[PDB]
Write a protein that binds this ligand. Structure first.
Ligand code: TA1
Ligand code: GTP
Ligand code: ANP
Ligand code: GDP
Ligand code: MG
Ligand code: MG
Lengths: 366, 441, 429
């Protein structure tokens, strides 16, 4: 299904930081349409999105919680997953824009990721029948300085236990990680425990912009297979489908002029910005492709893109969520983010469902 | 007395500084060793002025200056060359590595570990400036250092001092000629910043000076060792007013205001009378009227910009040698009399003037022949924007594909910074449109 | 000062290294003993660029030799300049790989790479300011390729901020040396592109035609071809060791040459050559040099530009020259032959000038190019590869060392991708 990507946006409000150092509002939501006032009051930029939420305030219409945003954005992808489609959602934006606060959220207001996860487990409960057997697995890993590390591993005891892995490209199913310890899911409780361990061990750190920053890229994969009956008088349960869900928490530019730092700090920031740039180029060429343009896609210019190839494009029903700030202090960043997103709507891939009727005759009969 | 600080950053400046300071000595009769056997002969005079040179009881003299280029291979030539016994040896050969045309390196990453010295010697040199202070900086737009380090530097200087003249001299990137392919990224980033801290930045170019070096100087195969001398003499012809007497002198600050109508158009050009080879030292009288025509000849402009596609906001003209103001009023009269020249309606005044008795001098082994007089011109004009237009076009063409970008990011420069600087430059482009359009009622 | 570590790996490289230092020593007034007997401080002001010093005013090069599986070891040592090399830097093992990459990457080189890497660390630490690395090798073979890329990667992890350059003899279209070059190289390219800042793609065939026609030599040898390779290796870094009106360095070469991080393969050239007779029948000018420089037959890479286009070049000149004539000449080339160049790069060329000519020439130049023609070599290796891969023609020899089909497959996808990338910009717009 040559089909597009759902692009959603969430303007978080200002903070103690702006209260201490006054930073006016410039982002404005006409219900859902995004409008940004230049502090010079010379231009208003405006952007239109398939989805909007106005978390700037709780009161005016357009407001939405984590789960409102879920049932707007991610529950449909749950639907397409049970339809059998691979699915993607990934975040974008700067530091302190609640990109984690949205996707993952915290303990008290967890994000789209945990909402979807419990919805998925109970949605399997809805059809926990012998009509269709279900089997769910998940992996969870991180990207730091182009190095891949396993979030679900209890590290050993050593001064250096951040065991790197490497990537390999199956000629058919595409990239994957060696040693990636994909584990079985019984329920959202198990998912929760896994996520807790991983987010704990993630290489994150405090800084001058936020108390805790996602200095590494995080990937959270689920794959649900569902074995169903075929339409034959013989072995009926010989049909199966798979659906691969991919939820991605990226990092922010973290411009060093404000993110004054040194050593390993600046190193991580450099690698991050490099990665995100590569991603942006991927996104742009994808948009041009969706415009019908014959274009070479530098998936291979980094690791993030390479792994997420089949999700940024390929075969999956996908979405992006962009996080943006109201403070004029970072209006440039928010504008860049909004332009990224409004370009992002234009992207399409060709999404179907992964029966994998291999050595089955079912697809051939079909 | 008045004083000034000559800084050279990167290659281009230093090559010019060598050229510049070579001239000053001759103009002051000083030997390379800092001594004055001419003063042994004369036994008087302040020719080794406090303005550009200090002095000691040994009879030595030291220029008020400094340089740094992150390329030891350059300064070392100076450190072993004829003038090694002149300069303060504390010159900042910090060139463990160069910025390699990457702003992000010279500005941020490896402009570190260096600048804390550059500022310090400045203070030590500053502390002796019991006079005026205005800075003279030599850099090249588009080059990694000349843009990176220069931007970092002036930012701090405007904070260490702020309330001072900080005048740059710099080569704009030509439309066509280039020794690099990322100058456009580098240049635009520069103007994002130095626009704000600075107060004036005389721009030049190699293509024009090359052309001048052909047509009038009759040179088939010119090179850097002649251009710098033309660029030097200007800087003298400016700075002379601080050094010698004149029927009509001028300060640096006078240039700061008469040529600078609004805070954001402090970017003018220059000309001179280097139209004289040794053979054509004859066949002409080289009058006041004669040259003053020539100063506004499109050909003898020092960048690739037709005045005739624009107008003149303000001009200042500094004469040297046997020059009488009466002639100046006469020649300047005729210049107003011509319609090829378009001024704004704002400036009936239009022109500022300046005269010093002290003629030019001539470098032995050089090219320009002796002349009893000479003049320099400056001009703030709307015409330049076409050059700005060429650049921003180049930037956009290639930036669209984000070419060469990963290198800067590899050094820590966020993406949209480029776009931030771009939007600025379009504003400057609009600013020139604003001023240029005539008023009505 | 900027310092470089030069490394030799493989029969073809070490000889290139062997011919290399013989040229540098001549460019610095040094004897086979390592003493100074020159006449200019310039030969010494920056000797620490390539060499270390020793007690009695001797000068040891920063050279390392790693594939001295001994058969070529004596060949180097019992040579006119074998003796200068640090004996401790003569690292080696035995039981040569037999051109099997896997032996040269996974088994034997694994045992040895520690030791050579250890020595590199010494030469690194003894430096004051390390800039980059300079490896000589060849693709298609076992040692030069496998052990190369191995050693390249490790060093990159240890010095990822630093530069890694290579000068790699490439497999031919037509005249092979080994029969598994498509196998040996593509594996190399997989690791070469990803762990490199630049590499200089050299083909033997072009060098033959080059020496055959312009140099008009009827009996050229491997000893003489190299003599041209060493020149370019020296010209690239002339502005490093020597001064000039406009200076250049390795870092300044890349950033102006590498727009996208993967298109870092190049087509070098060098001027001037005239077969001694015509020396009386010309004169050296800037347009003259330029004319040879962009000569489609002076390209040692064997990828005819005229079926493709240039992204960006670097024309490093050497000698007393005027810059006007220099900058003018590049523009003319950009003008008249514009179709061979990219639109979306507004100026498709840089420059660099050093004021110190070579031993017996008044002016010299060195060419560096990045072009779309490199596609062709890459197709060849790919097309040759698949025809053998699908039948598993020779595969069993590597699998005996532990490789698997995926690895051969991986590189293929990568190599084809590099091609497509070039092909993206191959069409004028
Ligand atoms: C000596 C002399 O006056 O005669 C010339 C000469 O005949 C010509 C033809 C030389 C000569 O080139 C060759 O004969 C040759 C043969 C096979 C393979 C390669 C070269 C020359 O050997 C080459 C040699 O060039 C050098 O001396 C440089 O050092 C050059 N390398 C060497 O030749 C060399 C090799 C070993 C030991 C010492 C010097 C070089 C190249 C790159 C960087 C620095 C230096 C020169 C001027 C000549 C001879 C000697 C005949 C030419 O090459 C150079 C570099 O000059 C070939 O075309 C040029 C023009 C020269 O006029
Ligand atoms: N007119 C003139 N221009 C020069 C001279 N030396 C260098 N340049 C200019 O400098 C530019 C090259 O970049 P530079 O700014 O010199 O580089 P740098 O100052 O050495 O610092 P890097 O950019 O890090 O090399 C070119 O546009 C040259 O025209 C000179 O002697 N005279
Ligand atoms: N719209 C919002 N409403 C209420 N609270 C918010 C909102 N957005 C963010 N927050 C809170 O404010 C804090 C700032 O967000 P933060 O988690 O720092 O952004 P982030 O996702 O970490 N960016 P990065 O660290 O670069 O990935 C978070 O801890 C959130 O709990
Ligand atoms: N230019 C040049 N090339 C050589 C020389 N000797 C060998 N070669 C090339 O190097 C290749 C041999 O690879 P080699 O490195 O010996 O294999 P390995 O050492 O076992 O990896 C062949 O393609 C030869 O053409 C030489 O002296 N000069
Ligand atoms: Mg976060
Ligand atoms: Mg420099």
């Amino acid at each position: 299904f040559n089909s597009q990507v759902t692009v959603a946006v969430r303007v978080r409000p200002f903070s103690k930081r702006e209260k201490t150092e006054k930073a006016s509002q410039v982002v404005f939501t006409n219900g859902e349409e995004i409008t940004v006032e230049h502090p010079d009051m010379k231009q208003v930029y405006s952007f239109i999105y398939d989805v909007s939420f106005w978390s700037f305030d709780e009161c005016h219409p357009g407001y939405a919680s984590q789960t409102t945003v879920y049932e707007t954005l991610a529950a449909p992808l749950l639907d397409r997953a049970f339809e059998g489609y691979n699915t993607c959602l990934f975040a974008y934006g700067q530091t302190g824009s609640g990109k984690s606060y949205t996707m993952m959220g915290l303990n008290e207001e967890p994000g789209i990721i945990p909402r979807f996860c419990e919805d998925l487990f109970a949605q399997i409960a809805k059809k926990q029948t012998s009509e269709v057997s279900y089997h769910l697995e998940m992996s969870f890993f991180e990207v730091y300085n182009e190095k891949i590390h396993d979030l679900l591993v209890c590290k050993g005891e050593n001064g250096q236990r951040k065991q790197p892995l490497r990537a390999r490209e199956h000629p058919v199913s595409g990239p994957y990680v060696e040693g990636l310890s994909m584990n079985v899911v019984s329920s959202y409780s198990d998912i929760q425990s896994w996520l807790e361990l991983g987010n704990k061990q993630r290489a994150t750190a405090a800084t001058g912009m936020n108390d805790k920053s996602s200095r590494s890229h995080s990937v959270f994969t689920l794959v649900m297979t569902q074995t169903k009956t075929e339409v034959v008088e013989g072995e009926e349960h010989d049909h199966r489908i798979t659906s691969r869900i991919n939820l991605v928490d990226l990092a922010g530019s973290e411009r060093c002029s404000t993110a004054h730092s040194s050593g390993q700090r600046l190193k991580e920031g450099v690698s991050i910005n490099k990665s995100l740039l590569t991603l942006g180029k991927v996104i742009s060429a994808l948009s041009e492709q969706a415009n019908g343009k014959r274009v070479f896609i530098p998936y291979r210019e980094s690791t993030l893109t390479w792994l997420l190839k089949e999700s940024l494009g390929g075969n999956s029903k996908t979405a992006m969520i962009a996080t943006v700030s109201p403070a004029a202090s970072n209006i440039e960043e928010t504008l860049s983010t909004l332009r990224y997103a409004t370009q992002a709507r234009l992207i399409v891939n060709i999404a179907k469902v992964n029966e994998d009727m291999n050595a089955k005759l079912i697809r051939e009969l079909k | 007395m008045r004083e000034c600080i000559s800084i050279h950053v990167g290659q281009a400046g230093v090559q010019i500084g060598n050229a510049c300071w070579e001239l000053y000595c001759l103009e002051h009769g000083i030997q390379p060793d800092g001594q004055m056997p001419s003063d042994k002969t004369i036994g008087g005079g302040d020719d080794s002025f406090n303005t550009f040179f200090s002095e000691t009881g040994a009879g030595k003299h030291v220029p008020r200056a400094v340089f740094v280029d992150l390329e030891p291979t350059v300064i070392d030539e100076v450190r072993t060359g004829t003038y090694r016994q002149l300069f303060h040896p504390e010159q900042l050969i910090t060139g463990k590595e160069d910025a390699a045309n990457n702003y992000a390196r010279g500005h941020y990453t490896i402009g570190k570990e260096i600048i804390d010295l550059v500022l310090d010697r400045i203070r030590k040199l500053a502390d002796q400036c019991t006079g005026l202070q205005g800075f003279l900086v030599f850099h090249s737009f588009g080059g990694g250092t000349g843009s990176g380090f220069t931007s970092l530097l002036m930012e701090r200087l405007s904070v260490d001092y702020g309330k001072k003249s900080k005048l740059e001299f710099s080569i704009y990137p030509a439309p066509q000629v280039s020794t690099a392919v990322v100058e456009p990224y580098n240049s635009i980033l520069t103007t994002h910043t130095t626009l704000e801290h600075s107060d004036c930045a005389f721009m030049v170019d190699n293509e024009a000076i090359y052309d001048i070096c052909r047509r009038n100087l009759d040179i088939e195969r010119p090179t850097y060792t002649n251009l710098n001398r033309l660029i030097s003499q200007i800087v003298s012809s400016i700075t002379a007013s601080l050094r010698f007497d004149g029927a009509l002198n001028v300060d640096l600050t006078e240039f700061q205001t008469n040529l600078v109508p609004y805070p954001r158009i402090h970017f003018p050009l220059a000309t001179y009378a280097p139209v004289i080879s040794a053979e054509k030292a004859y066949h002409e009288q080289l009058s006041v009227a004669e040259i003053t025509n020539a100063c506004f000849e499109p050909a003898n402009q020092m960048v690739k910009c037709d005045p005739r596609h624009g107008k003149y906001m303000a001009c200042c003209l500094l004469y040297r040698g046997d020059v009488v103001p009466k002639d100046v009023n006469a020649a300047i009269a005729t210049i107003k009399t011509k319609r090829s020249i378009q001024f704004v309606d704002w400036c009936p005044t239009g022109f500022k003037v300046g005269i010093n008795y002290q003629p030019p001098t001539v470098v032995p082994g050089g090219d320009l022949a002796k002349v009893q007089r000479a003049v320099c011109m400056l001009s703030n004009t709307t015409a330049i924007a076409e050059a700005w237009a060429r650049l921003d076009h180049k930037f956009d063409l290639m930036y669209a594909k984000r070419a060469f970008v990963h290198w800067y990011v590899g050094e820590g420069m966020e993406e949209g910074e480029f776009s931030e600087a771009r939007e600025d430059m379009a504003a400057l482009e609009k600013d020139y449109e604003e001023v240029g359009v005539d008023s009505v009622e | 000062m900027r310092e470089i570590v030069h490394i030799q790996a493989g029969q073809c490289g070490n000889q290139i290294g062997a011919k290399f230092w013989e040229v540098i020593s001549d460019e610095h007034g040094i004897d086979p003993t390592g003493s100074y007997h020159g006449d200019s401080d310039l030969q010494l002001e920056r000797i620490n660029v390539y060499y270390n010093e020793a007690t009695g005013n001797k000068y040891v090069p920063r050279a390392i030799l790693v594939d001295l599986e001994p058969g070529t070891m004596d060949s180097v040592r019992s040579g006119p300049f074998g003796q200068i090399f640090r004996p401790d830097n003569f690292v080696f093992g035995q039981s040569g790989a037999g051109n099997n990459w896997a032996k040269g990457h996974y088994t034997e080189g694994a045992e040895l790479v520690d030791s050579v890497l250890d020595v590199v660390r010494k030469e690194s630490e003894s430096c004051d300011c390390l800039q980059g690395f300079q490896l000589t090798h060849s693709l298609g073979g076992g040692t030069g390729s496998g052990m190369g890329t191995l050693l390249i990667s490790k060093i990159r992890e240890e010095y990822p901020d630093r530069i890694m350059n290579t000068f790699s003899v490439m497999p031919s279209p037509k005249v092979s040396d080994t029969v598994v070059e498509p196998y040996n190289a593509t594996l190399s390219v997989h690791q070469l592109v990803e762990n490199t800042d630049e590499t200089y793609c050299i083909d033997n065939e072009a060098l033959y035609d080059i020496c055959f026609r312009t140099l008009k030599l009827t009996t050229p040898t491997y000893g003489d071809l190299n003599h041209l390779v060493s020149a370019t290796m020296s010209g690239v870094t002339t502005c490093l060791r020597f001064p000039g009106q406009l200076n250049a360095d390795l870092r300044k070469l890349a950033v102006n040459m590498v727009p996208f991080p993967r298109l870092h393969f190049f087509m070098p050239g060098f001027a001037p050559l005239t077969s001694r007779g015509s020396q009386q029948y010309r004169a050296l000018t800037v347009p003259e040099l330029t004319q040879q420089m962009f000569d489609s037959k002076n390209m040692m890479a064997a990828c005819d530009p005229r079926h493709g286009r240039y992204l960006t070049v670097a024309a490093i000149f050497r000698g007393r020259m005027s810059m006007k004539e220099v900058d003018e000449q590049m523009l003319n080339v950009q003008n008249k032959n514009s179709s061979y160049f990219v639109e979306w790069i507004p100026n498709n060329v840089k420059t660099a000038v050093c004021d110190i000519p070579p031993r017996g020439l008044k002016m010299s130049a060195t060419f560096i190019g990045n072009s779309t023609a490199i596609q062709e070599l890459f197709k060849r290796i790919s097309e040759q590869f698949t025809a053998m891969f699908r039948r598993k023609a020779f595969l069993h020899w590597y699998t005996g060392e532990g490789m698997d089909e995926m690895e051969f497959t991986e590189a293929e996808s990568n190599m084809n991708d590099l091609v497509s990338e070039y092909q993206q910009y191959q069409d004028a717009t």
